[PDB]
Each structure stands twice: as structure tokens, then as C-alpha cells.
């Protein structure tokens, strides 16, 4: 709920390049300035003879807001022989997937084709490039000697990628073995050390790979999406992968052991052609240090009040338990054909409340398909069902839809303010956007009314005027606040009190404040972080019995507290915000004594 939508950082790429198709953060190991990584898989490059090779760009955070391509590969197509290319890099979609871990950047071209050395073929084995500072190596685990659709010739390796905690790569190739799909995992140390430009099919030791299976599993698309997390408690990240055509288009998600690629757990979708497994994520949302599985089914159709099926999409949340079982819940989209669940991004702890959070995208929702991203906050029970924020894409396009939210990445504190921030890609308008998380102020409020019981015949107070006394009581409102991260030590609060709030438009308010002679009192306050309860007393009274014949309904004393956000800003330009999960109103009630 604390993302700054007023002034997000806005980045652009060449028209038609799908800039923003993939996004990630880049944090070097030397604590250098952080950057944004943005894939533009259709971007034209300087590679000789290559049309729309695609590129990955590094973007400064706010120093200049500028993006410069990363030179993974400056060359064109290698030749097998004169006028006989060994490979085809045009329209290879380099940058369709991008992932970074510390110094390392992995970027892939899922539609890279190669010839093979025996016949003149054009097989989309896919390829990747791994950059670690000075050294860059090619990583094409599917460019092997297992040729054609039967083997890995159409694997499109790099279609999805992730890094494990222990510097292993997880790579998805949805085309292997007549589109069964495949998962391959290699140690980054093996990928760099064994790289030889003269060898097209590199033998990596300690490679883990799923194996070809029976034809019944054909056309399942294993490796369409991947995520990593530990699910047998041995500290080694395990491989989670969406399989969206499996089980006769119900969709499945496979989890494999990260040490040996043994099958661990399966999930199965409930509805045909829902694309269950289009997206997957793993993050501990309920704070028990057990990774939880998130699975997106963007085409899921829900039954409405009228009984009509409506395509709104669905996301399933599976909490991991010590026993090994899973506790599953479903989250439905809000707008028809919006494809809620197309992208699921762990946010880290967005509001720094102790529970991790997530963002779920509906890339085709909103006005004129501008796109919507939903923020969901975690809690001990699981994920909170109601989104606490709604980001709306602002840009429209003239051909392919903007697709705001089609890719996202969070869980990086790029401005070092103590709250993780979020990147949203919008490739149909060639835009990528960073949203910064605002500091969160938690307020403890107190309101005491004494005496609670009021006897009209107890007139011990005298009004400022002649009056001849009234029945009075005390009201004491207190307020206390603190925060986490970059914040000032002084905040201006606007506090409002309203006596006998129950009574509505056209009803008598029985209680009034002593001074004001009105039922409303407003007081500005100044409070500092970590400080003590700062209280204030004032006095109120009851009208004469003559003016109200309602002595039964209780008199409610209502208190509101708001904050002026502009005055608390910091060097970033980033105002804090009140914790939306503590209510900003409190109320007590007095009662009229009866005889």
C-alpha cells in the first residue's frame, strides 16, 4: 500500500522493441550504484547482418535515468561454411528473459536457431549469455547433439530462467522431446570454466536435467516458467516449474529436488485451458521461513451471480508445512479478460511489517487495456485476500496492447530507504517503470471518556456564560507514532473529535464541547518517532433534558487522526504514509443514567 505512484521513475526504449518484456535489478558485489536491467527482445543491434537480435539494457537510477545496451555479444552469425551460416541470430529475442545475482547477469534468446553440423537445419535450441564483470560466456545447454524435435532441437532453452541461492542456474526449455519440455540446472562455475568457443555442445559436469518420457507427456511445456525455493528443508533450493498444457490442458506445476532433479511434489489445475502454470513464484509470505508456491492461471473462468462463465484469471497460494503437505487457497481476478495472474512478483516485505508480500499483474485490465498491478500483503495466516494497492498503467499504444505488468520484479531496496521497490514492465508501449516504497508510520491512538455514565441531574460544571450549569465529562485523546527507515523525528498530525457521532443528518447531538458549544473540536498536534504518548484533555457537557427525548441510544465519542504527508518528506522526495492496517479512527461511548 506504500508504493509511490505520484512520481515513479519512467524509462523508455525504441518503438517496437518490446522494451520492458523482462525486468530485474542489478546489484554489483562491491556495493556500487544499483541499476535496472530491462530486456528489449525485438530491438535492433549493431551485430553485422542481424535484424532484431534484441538487447538487454542497464539503466541508471536517477543519476540520469538513461539506459545503455550491455554488450553480451557484438558479433553476427558464425559461418559453418561460405554462405552457410552456423546460427541465425535475427529475431532471436535476446533479452526475452533476464536474471541477475550479484555480479552475474544471465540473458537468453529463446528463438535463437542453429544449423547443426551434419545437415542444413534451422533448429531453435535457444541460447544464453552469462556475464560476470569482464568475462562473458555463451550458455546453450540445449544446443547439443540430441537433434530435432525428438531431442533438444526445439527446446528454446532460456525461455525461463532463475538463479539458486548457491549459484546454480535453473533453465527452462519448453520444446524438448516433442514439447514435453525440460529443466536443466548447471553450476555457474562449470558454465564459465568449461566454456570453449570452438565447442558448440559443451560437456558440463554435475548437470541436472529432466529426462525424456513417454509420448503421453508430449506437448506439456515443462519449463514454460520457473522459480526456486526449498521444499524438503535441506537448505538447497529446489526447482519449481509451470507445465501449462499437462494433464490434458488442466495444467500442472512440477517441483524437483535441487540436488538430484528427483520429483518431489505436483500441483494440478482444476479447469481446462486455464493456462495453470503460466507463471510461478516462491516466497515465504506467512513468516514461518517455509517457501510458499504461487501459481497463475490467467485464463481461469469464474461463475458469476448470473451463472455466466467469465474469464478473470486465478492465482493459487500454497503454504508449505513441515509435514510436507501444502495448504492451498485461490485468488480470483477482478476484470474479465484482464488475465489476472499473468505475472507474479515476490516483493519482499514491502511495508516492513514482518511478512513478505507479492504483486500480481492483470496486464490487459484497466481503461483501454492500460494494465493493472495488484499488491497483496502477507500475514501469519497466509496472504491477505484483498489487495492493499492497485497500480494502473498510464500509457496507451497503437498496435500491440501496452501490457503493463506483463513482467515485474521487486524485493530490492534500490534507494536504500529500508523498503523494497518494484519494477513494472510494459512492453507494448516500450516502457519500464520503477515504483519506490514509502516509509510506513504506525500510530497508537487512545481515547478515554470519564465519567462513562452521565447523570443529567449531576451539574457540577459552569459554562463561560451565565448558563446556570450543565452536566459535564472529560475527553482525553492520545496519539503515539513510530516508524522504520529514513524518517524525520517530528510529524504534524490533524486530530478531529466529534461528540454524539451516531446521530446523523437531521438528528439532535446531545453532547457538546464546553468551550466551542459545538459537537466538533479539531486540534493540530506534533509528535516525534519513538516518543511517548502525547495526550490532551478537554471538557464536554449535555444539553438540557428539554431538548432531546432520546436518553437510550449511547453517546459515541469519535476521534480521527490524519497526517500531513508533504511536511515529512526526505531527501528522496518520498513522503511517509500511515500504516493502512491500523485504523485511523477510534471511538468510545458514554451513557445517560436512567431513573
Amino acid at each position, epitope marked *: 500500500f506504500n508504493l509511490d505512484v505520484d512520481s515513479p521513475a519512467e524509462y523508455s526504449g525504441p518503438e517496437g522493441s518490446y522494451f520492458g518484456f523482462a525486468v530485474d535489478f542489478f546489484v554489483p558485489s562491491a556495493s556500487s550504484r544499483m541499476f535496472l536491467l530491462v530486456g528489449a527482445p525485438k530491438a535492433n543491434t549493431t551485430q553485422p547482418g542481424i535484424v532484431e537480435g534484441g538487447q538487454v539494457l542497464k539503466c541508471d537510477w536517477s543519476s540520469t535515468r538513461r539506459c545503455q545496451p550491455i554488450e553480451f555479444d557484438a558479433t553476427g552469425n558464425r559461418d559453418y561454411a561460405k554462405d552457410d551460416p552456423l546460427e541465425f541470430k535475427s529475431h532471436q529475442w535476446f533479452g526475452a528473459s533476464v536474471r541477475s545475482k550479484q555480479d552475474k547477469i544471465l540473458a537468453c534468446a529463446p528463438l535463437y536457431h542453429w544449423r547443426t553440423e551434419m545437415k542444413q537445419e534451422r533448429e531453435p535450441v535457444g541460447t544464453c549469455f552469462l556475464q560476470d564483470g569482464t568475462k562473458t560466456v555463451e550458455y546453450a545447454p540445449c544446443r*547439443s547433439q540430441d537433434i530435432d524435435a525428438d531431442g533438444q532441437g526445439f527446446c528454446q532453452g532460456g525461455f525461463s530462467i532463475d538463479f539458486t541461492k548457491a549459484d546454480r542456474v535453473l533453465l527452462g526449455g519448453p520444446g524438448s522431446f516433442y514439447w514435453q519440455g525440460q529443466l536443466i540446472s548447471d553450476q555457474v562455475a562449470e558454465i564459465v570454466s568449461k566454456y570453449d568457443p570452438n565447442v558448440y*555442445s559443451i560437456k558440463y559436469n554435475n548437470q541436472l536435467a529432466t529426462r525424456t518420457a513417454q509420448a503421453i507427456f508430449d506437448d506439456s511445456y515443462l519449463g514454460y516458467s520457473v522459480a526456486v525455493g526449498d521444499f524438503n528443508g535441506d537448505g538447497i533450493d529446489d526447482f519449481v516449474s509451470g507445465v501449462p498444457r499437462a494433464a490434458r490442458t488442466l495444467g500442472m506445476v512440477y517441483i524437483y529436488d535441487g540436488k538430484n532433479m528427483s520429483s518431489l511434489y505436483n500441483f494440478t489445475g482444476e479447469q481446462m485451458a486455464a493456462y495453470f502454470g503460466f507463471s510461478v513464484a516462491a516466497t515465504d509470505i506467512n513468516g514461518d521461513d517455509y517457501a510458499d508456491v504461487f501459481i497463475g492461471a490467467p485464463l481461469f473462468m469464474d461463475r458469476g451471480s448470473d451463472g455466466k462463465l467469465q474469464e478473470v484469471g486465478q492465482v493459487s497460494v500454497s503454504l508449505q508445512r513441515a509435514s510436507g503437505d501444502f495448504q492451498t487457497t485461490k485468488l480470483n481476478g477482478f476484470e474479465v479478460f484482464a488475465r489476472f495472474g499473468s505475472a507474479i512478483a515476490p516483493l519482499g516485505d514491502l511495508d516492513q511489517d514482518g511478512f513478505n508480500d507479492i504483486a500480481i499483474a492483470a496486464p490487459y485490465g484497466g481503461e483501454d487495456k492500460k494494465g493493472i498491478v495488484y499488491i497483496f500483503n502477507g500475514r501469519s495466516t497466509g496472504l491477505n485476500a484483498v489487495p492493499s494497492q492497485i497500480l494502473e498503467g498510464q500509457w496507451a499504444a497503437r498496435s500491440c496492447p501496452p501490457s503493463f505488468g506483463y513482467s515485474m520484479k521487486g524485493a530490492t531496496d534500490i534507494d536504500k530507504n529500508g523498503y523494497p521497490d518494484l519494477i513494472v514492465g510494459a512492453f507494448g508501449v516500450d516502457r519500464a517503470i520503477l515504483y519506490r516504497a514509502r516509509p510506513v508510520i504506525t500510530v497508537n491512538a487512545g481515547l478515554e471518556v470519564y465519567p462513562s455514565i452521565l447523570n443529567q441531574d449531576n451539574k457540577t460544571c459552569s459554562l463561560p456564560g451565565t448558563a446556570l450549569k450543565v452536566s459535564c465529562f472529560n475527553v482525553r485523546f492520545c496519539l503515539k507514532a513510530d516508524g522504520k527507515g529514513v524518517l524525520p523525528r517530528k510529524l504534524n498530525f490533524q486530530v478531529e473529535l466529534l461528540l454524539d457521532k451516531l446521530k446523523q443528518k437531521g438528528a439532535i447531538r446531545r453532547a457538546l464541547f464546553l468551550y466551542s458549544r459545538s459537537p466538533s473540536h479539531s486540534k493540530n498536534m506534533t509528535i516525534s518517532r519513538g516518543g511517548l504518548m502525547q495526550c490532551e484533555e478537554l471538557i464536554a457537557y449535555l444539553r438540557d433534558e428539554s431538548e432531546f427525548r432520546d436518553k437510550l441510544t449511547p453517546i459515541t465519542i469519535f476521534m480521527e487522526y490524519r497526517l500531513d504527508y508533504r511536511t515529512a518528506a526526505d531527501t528522496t522526495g518520498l513522503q511517509p504514509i500511515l500504516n493502512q492496517f491500523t485504523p485511523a479512527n477510534i471511538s468510545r461511548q458514554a451513557h445517560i443514567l436512567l431513573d
Partner: antibody
Amino acid sequence: QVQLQQSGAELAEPGASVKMSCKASGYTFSSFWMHWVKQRPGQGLEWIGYINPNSGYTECNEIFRDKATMTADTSSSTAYMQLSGLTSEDSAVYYCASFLGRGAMDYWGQGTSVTVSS
Amino acid sequence: DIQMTQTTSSLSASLGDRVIISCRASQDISNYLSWYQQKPDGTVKLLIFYTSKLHSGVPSRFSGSGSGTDYSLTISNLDQEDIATYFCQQGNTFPYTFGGGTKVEMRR
């Protein structure tokens, strides 16, 4: 740390057949072709053929088209060659060798001697 | 089939010497020529592939040259562990074929 471990020496009478194994480790066996090479005692090297382990497809030198049959067990990372119709001309050391690509074979097994004798 | 012929079947060398082994193919093999070392015990290792490319783990002393039909392996600064038999092999076209072999023995 590629290692091709071949089975022990074979003996057989003329007209019989033998089957030898070649177990691979250190790389993903099913992603690379396995080649087989025959060396007669006091003679040169002769290429038999190759197998694509994961699909079972094979190509052979014309000489050995009827002599040898190659197979593979992907679950145990083991290639097999059977020599049938044995004669004294089939007495030799038989090597397995993984395919580097680039028309070369990068790692060799120690060889399996075959002796054809009554 | 492509016929491979290593003209000299044996040559003798002293430690540190430079040894050159020549291989000729009966047709253009487009640089798909490899070199193998076979030790007395039968161990076989790949040294050079694609005419001049070095296999991983192979010492820099070994290098290869040639094009078309003529190719050569060169051992500079001969070592005691280099006494073995060396074969060339074309991989341009099936069936793969080897040369007859060249044995390198110490001088005495």
C-alpha cells in the same frame, strides 16, 4: 572429469556373438553421441559407427553394417555394442568414445579386447 | 571413403626436440582433422581437433596446422610422457577414417 568405463575382455567361439558395455560419467550421457572404434592387434584404427543415445538412431561404416548393433540405456548412462557372427577377423580391441562435435571424439574408454577362438 | 596416410610410420626424437608429424587426405576435408595420442598401454587421448584447436587439459606443446588435404601435428619441447603413437582422423564425412599412425620413440 569425463570417464568412459568399458567392460572386461570377451571370449567367444566362431559364429557366436558378444555384447560389451561402456558406462559414462562426468557429463549428460543422453546429450552426446557415442562412437565405437575397432583396433586389431598390430593394426590401425577403424571407425564402426555412432549412436544417438536418447533416440537410438545409429549410423555405421558400411563394413560393419551387418556385424555390429549399437544400443544404449539412458537410465544407467551405458552404451552397448553387440558383435554377431564372430570370426577371427573380429578379434580386436573395441573402444567407445564420446563425440566432441567438430568431427572429433574427445574422451575414450580403455578398450575391450575380443578374442575369437575355438 | 577418405583415405588418410601418415607417410612416416615411425620417427625417433630426443628430449626437448621439435617433432612434426604429417597427414595427407585423399580429398579436401575442410579442416575437419583431429589428432590422437595412443600410449603403449592402449590409453587414447584427443589432442587437437579442427586442425588447430586444443582439447581441454592438453599441454600447449601440441599444435596443429594445415588445410585442404595436407595437415601436420607439431610437438615442441618433447617430453618423456610424449613417447606414444599419433593418429590423424578426418571428420568431414562419414565414415570417419584414420591414418595409419606414427610412432615417436626416444633417441639413444
